[PDB]
Symmetry: C3
Subunit: 329 residues, 3 copies
Amino acid sequence: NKKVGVIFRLIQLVVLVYVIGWVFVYEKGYQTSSGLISSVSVKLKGLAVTQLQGLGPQVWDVADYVFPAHGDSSFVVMTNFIMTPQQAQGHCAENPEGGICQDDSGCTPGKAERKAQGIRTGNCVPFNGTVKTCEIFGWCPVEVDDKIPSPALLHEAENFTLFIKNSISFPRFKVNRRNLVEEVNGTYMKKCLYHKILHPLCPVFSLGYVVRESGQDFRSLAEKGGVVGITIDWECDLDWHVRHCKPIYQFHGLYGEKNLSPGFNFRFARHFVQNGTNRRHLFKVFGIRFDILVDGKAGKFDIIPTMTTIGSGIGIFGVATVLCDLLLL
Amino acid sequence: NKKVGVIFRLIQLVVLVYVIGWVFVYEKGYQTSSGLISSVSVKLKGLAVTQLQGLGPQVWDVADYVFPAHGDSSFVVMTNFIMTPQQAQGHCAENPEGGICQDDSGCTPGKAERKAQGIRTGNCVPFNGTVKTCEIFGWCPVEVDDKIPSPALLHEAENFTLFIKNSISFPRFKVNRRNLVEEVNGTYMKKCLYHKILHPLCPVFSLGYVVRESGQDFRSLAEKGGVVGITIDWECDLDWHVRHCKPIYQFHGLYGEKNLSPGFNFRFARHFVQNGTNRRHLFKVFGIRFDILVDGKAGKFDIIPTMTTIGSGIGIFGVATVLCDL
Amino acid sequence: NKKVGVIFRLIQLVVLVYVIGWVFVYEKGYQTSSGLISSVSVKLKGLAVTQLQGLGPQVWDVADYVFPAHGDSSFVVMTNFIMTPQQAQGHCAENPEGGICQDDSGCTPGKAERKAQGIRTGNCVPFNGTVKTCEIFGWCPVEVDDKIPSPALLHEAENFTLFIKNSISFPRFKVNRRNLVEEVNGTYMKKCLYHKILHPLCPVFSLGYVVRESGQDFRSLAEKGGVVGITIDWECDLDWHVRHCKPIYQFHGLYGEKNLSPGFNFRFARHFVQNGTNRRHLFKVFGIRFDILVDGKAGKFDIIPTMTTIGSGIGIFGVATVLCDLLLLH
Ligand SMILES: Nc1ncnc2c1ncn2[C@@H]1O[C@H](COP(=O)(O)OP(=O)(O)OP(=O)(O)O)[C@@H](O)[C@H]1O
Ligand SMILES: Nc1ncnc2c1ncn2[C@@H]1O[C@H](COP(=O)(O)OP(=O)(O)OP(=O)(O)O)[C@@H](O)[C@H]1O
Ligand SMILES: Nc1ncnc2c1ncn2[C@@H]1O[C@H](COP(=O)(O)OP(=O)(O)OP(=O)(O)O)[C@@H](O)[C@H]1O
Ligand SMILES: Nc1cc(C(F)(F)F)cc(C(F)(F)F)c1
Ligand SMILES: *[C@@H]1O[C@H](CO)[C@@H](O)[C@H](O)[C@H]1NC(C)=O
Ligand SMILES: *[C@@H]1O[C@H](CO)[C@@H](O)[C@H](O)[C@H]1NC(C)=O
Ligand SMILES: *[C@@H]1O[C@H](CO)[C@@H](O)[C@H](O)[C@H]1NC(C)=O
Ligand SMILES: *[C@@H]1O[C@H](CO)[C@@H](O)[C@H](O)[C@H]1NC(C)=O
Ligand SMILES: *[C@@H]1O[C@H](CO)[C@@H](O)[C@H](O)[C@H]1NC(C)=O
Ligand SMILES: *[C@@H]1O[C@H](CO)[C@@H](O)[C@H](O)[C@H]1NC(C)=O
Ligand SMILES: *[C@@H]1O[C@H](CO)[C@@H](O)[C@H](O)[C@H]1NC(C)=O
Ligand SMILES: [Ca+2]
Ligand SMILES: [Ca+2]
Ligand SMILES: [Mg+2]
Ligand SMILES: [Mg+2]
Ligand SMILES: [Mg+2]
């Protein structure tokens, strides 16, 4: 029968076209792939002014707000802070949230099991005017975090500029690239603020723009803290020119339940010696955490994967040809 | 023919079971799989009181023993420390381990090639009544690490608590999750310590329990340092409800031969100005290093992988669909 | 015909030999593969003496130039620094680069949209003799960072020592390995210098030697910054003894165009209290950044991968029982 024969021939031609389009045009099986080694450097430029009641104006700069301060891919920018200054090692009342004693005999000398603020003397000196707390030996005065300022102190972090220098290298092809590849110049770097469509290759990002692209409001994320992840993807084709190699920036917002453990916060202390006494300033900072992850793949033409895909080709052609079985008749 | 015909049908049935089974039910083919982007924040709650001769009681808090102090996957908690206070830049005798000279002519001006402690002034100054060491320009009180306290100074480290907040997101499927599962609540967090079976979902870990689960003794580790790696695995099937996606915490102990370089140690310094002179306190800390690694995969139903698996099963059937006929 | 039959048998034998040699031996199909969990700790030994005009000699030790300072895998070693001491929050003329005002009227009270240096007071105060800049409220001495020193201040980093301790663990195989191997001992550790041919297992690396192996000049990198990545690869077969497991150290240099943002630089401040006043020393450091990335795989003999590879075998065998049979058409 001629009809079944021409149908079999059409099926064979369809399989041929599908394989030719898939193994080469679509999947690029003729190319071999390699993974990059990448290093990310971060530079924050911006100035913040905080004027707390009872304290003079305080200035925060690149060395102050960025916590790693050595170019780490994962970093934190200060958005709000609670400060306890002039902490000395002495005996003072503990934070009421830890424990409260109605009488001195109620408390017992020792250390708390889960949340310990110090060694309890057990004499119960008053913290509040009405209620008393256990006297501990620890840095005094104890930090209070019950009151969180609704307006963010470093509320201008929306307009701080972040410069990301990402240097990637493929050792299999021995090709080194950078996010400023062949388009950004000495004048372009000055006036480009990253937009999704307007200026994608520019490495100067606005923190507020990044937070808004991540899908989170900057005010609530700055008040209590947050996490924003920046991913730089490198899709490089060695067959084409190196100018075509361009990074893609993706911004995601990592959030959880607001009721339980809202935001990102951490406590750090600055130690000093004043008047012959060693003291410290303790800052509890709620800041947006920026984690930068770079992943990329480069493909270059090679003869061995080409021959492998061609053989896979001959193979799939075998499947189709074997089917006829002498025209099943 | 039936003697081997039923065997041929049985072989075909086995092929079909393999297709719709190990390739379809297990080793999910009816789902597309995506990796996550994860960020971890570590918070240490604990306080240590250390009595040191010549320095008095010292209080170590969250900001103190956490050297990163900001929150990172790799962080070290102080377990023991050797303190050299009031280091000032002036000519002084070097450490006896560096070099020993009976006379001043033995030492030569310059800098040591191996383990340089300072610039030699070409003179030898007695370190003590016993031995003399070459005079070098640097921090005047040289740190002596020969004596390590057998009882850990921060031995209360076992009970320091660690809260690990891990936020993951699968972008292809747009699902965001956190280690604080819906089963976990404020009242639970007020009184929970993680246990593998008793409290699997708890986000609060005891450092001593973590070190014990890693396979290392806490005392010997805190004496000289150690490495414990905490891996958080997220195996979530998005075909079910989102409540059924949870984290698995696994603890590993990264240790080596104690004869050569036992434990983990480092030196960090605190600089200050006293009496108009710049000084510093140098701490050589042996602390446990905790590394947080998060890897996970999420699978969601999709038409294209299902059709690809069905097509592969056809051809897996193809092999057997052959006939005993010339 | 005997010729077609012997050709068919020869092709079958060739396919069998290929299956035996490539699937089983080349890629080790009979061995299941597992990844590792790795931790890297870095320790720097070296001292630098930097003498600045008008200031006392400065000594830099391991605690000084190692910025993370907790043995972090990604770390930066100080190679050059520009220091502004005794900065106290006060009204000062802004850095000329940010702005140049001819008169007070030109200055506008407020902030700068890009690269803000302080809060403008609306006053044009003389930064120096010839030109004036708008007054700001910020640290008192603005960092004039124009003159990066040509000779590297911490040039003694050309001879520095770095000890990298890498501990890996395969949990599927429950095997723990370390960069320190049976070949390395304390007597060896004392005087060992890494040399990719002479001492491959040496754990003590020279920073200058690492930068040279990366493919970058040390002096240029120390002048304005650089990036060198050290990768530790653990590729071993656990069928043999664990002694055969050897790490491989590879060095790469991550560089860019010198015209656009050359090198790596970062600014950090040390805060203190002097005479009852909070002050700070600001340092702009150009230093080589070292990043440690560990990737490894271990293989152990198992019966399930062997059976799967065998099954894949008849798969190729059947293919040939019909391969040349479809070539047999003419
Ligand atoms: N976060 C940022 N925001 C805005 N501009 C930046 C940022 N980081 C760098 N730049 C600009 O890119 C150029 C090259 O960056 P580089 O890393 O060399 O900074 P730099 O020149 O060392 O710093 P400075 O400009 O303060 O001297 C600089 O002229 C600077 O103006
Ligand atoms: N390491 C820990 N051990 C025990 N409980 C913790 C720990 N970290 C956080 N918590 C508890 O989880 C709750 C929410 O966590 P979160 O990180 O928001 O703490 P917080 O609100 O900043 O309070 P705190 O200032 O006491 O850390 C807090 O009430 C706290 O008691
Ligand atoms: N950067 C380095 N260069 C050369 N040798 C080193 C370096 N770091 C450590 N070592 C040597 O390798 C060994 C590592 O052991 P470890 O670092 O635990 O010793 P340690 O007790 O800290 O003594 P040290 O403070 O002298 O290193 C030590 O004997 C030390 O002498
Ligand atoms: N050792 C180390 C250091 C950093 C840092 F120094 F860059 F923060 C990050 C990481 C992380 F695991 F998060 F990638 C590890
Ligand atoms: C009593 O203590 C609480 C904290 O638990 C505090 O909010 C309140 O202001 C105190 N009352 C005073 C100081 O009168
Ligand atoms: C950020 O945008 C402009 C400066 O570019 C300014 O008008 C605006 O007030 C800024 N917003 C904040 C919150 O500082
Ligand atoms: C810098 O590059 C941009 C595009 O990348 C271009 O528009 C601009 O003219 C360039 N600046 C020059 C050539 O001065
Ligand atoms: C807290 O969480 C635990 C975990 O299962 C649960 O059993 C308990 O009922 C919860 N308590 C409240 C008050 O929600
Ligand atoms: C004064 O500062 C300007 C900056 O605009 C600089 O060009 C000039 O050389 C400086 N003059 C002196 C004497 O320092
Ligand atoms: C390193 O040592 C060699 C040999 O002593 C010397 O020539 C070179 O100048 C040194 N490099 C420094 C001190 O930076
Ligand atoms: C030290 O290690 C080296 C290198 O493996 C070796 O040749 C030497 O014999 C070792 N010495 C001792 C005392 O173990
Ligand atoms: Ca001070
Ligand atoms: Ca760090
Ligand atoms: Mg609290
Ligand atoms: Mg020693
Ligand atoms: Mg400048």
